[PDB]
Amino acid sequence: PASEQETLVRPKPLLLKLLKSVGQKDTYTMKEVLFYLGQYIMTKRLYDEKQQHIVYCSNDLLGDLFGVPSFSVKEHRKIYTMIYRNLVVV
Ligand SMILES: CC[C@@H](C)Oc1cc2c(cc1OC)CC(=O)N(c1ccc(N(C)Cc3ccncc3)cc1)[C@H]2c1ccc(Cl)cc1
Numbered sequence: 001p002a003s004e005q006e007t008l009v010r011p012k013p014l015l016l017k018l019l020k021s022v023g024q025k026d027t028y029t030m031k032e033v034l035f036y037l038g039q040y041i042m043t044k045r046l047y048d049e050k051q052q053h054i055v056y057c058s059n060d061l062l063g064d065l066f067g068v069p070s071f072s073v074k075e076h077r078k079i080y081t082m083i084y085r086n087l088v089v090v
Pocket residue numbers: 005031033034035037038039041042047052053054055073075076077079080
């Protein structure tokens with residue numbers, strides 16, 4: 001649902017650290033978090049050049065945040081769950 005993107009969130013410390021490397025607020029929308037995380041992934045080239053939907057994060061703080069070595073950007077509910085576990089809904 002498009003509504004979930006409007007959710008107001010306060011990132012936990014590790015996610016806040018990651019967000020500050022790409023964008024400096026106390027409160028974000030889920031929309032903002034998704035775009036900042038997306039830019040983090042793209043900027044750092046964490047995705048497979050020949051398999052672009054797969055993000056590899058075992059050697060990155062993003063893997064610590066998410067608790068996985070990798071994931072597909074197509075795994076939408078999983079992405080939301082991994083993100084939600086790193087924040088407090090306001
Ligand atoms: C599951 C939520 C879904 C419903 O909504 C969104 C997804 C995304 C963005 C915004 C969204 O809603 C506002 C911003 C964004 O940029 N995204 C992205 C897309 C492709 C690629 N990659 C690596 C594939 C890619 C393929 C071809 N060229 C460049 C990259 C990397 C990142 C995803 C996204 C995915 C994974 C993570 Cl942890 C955060 C954000």
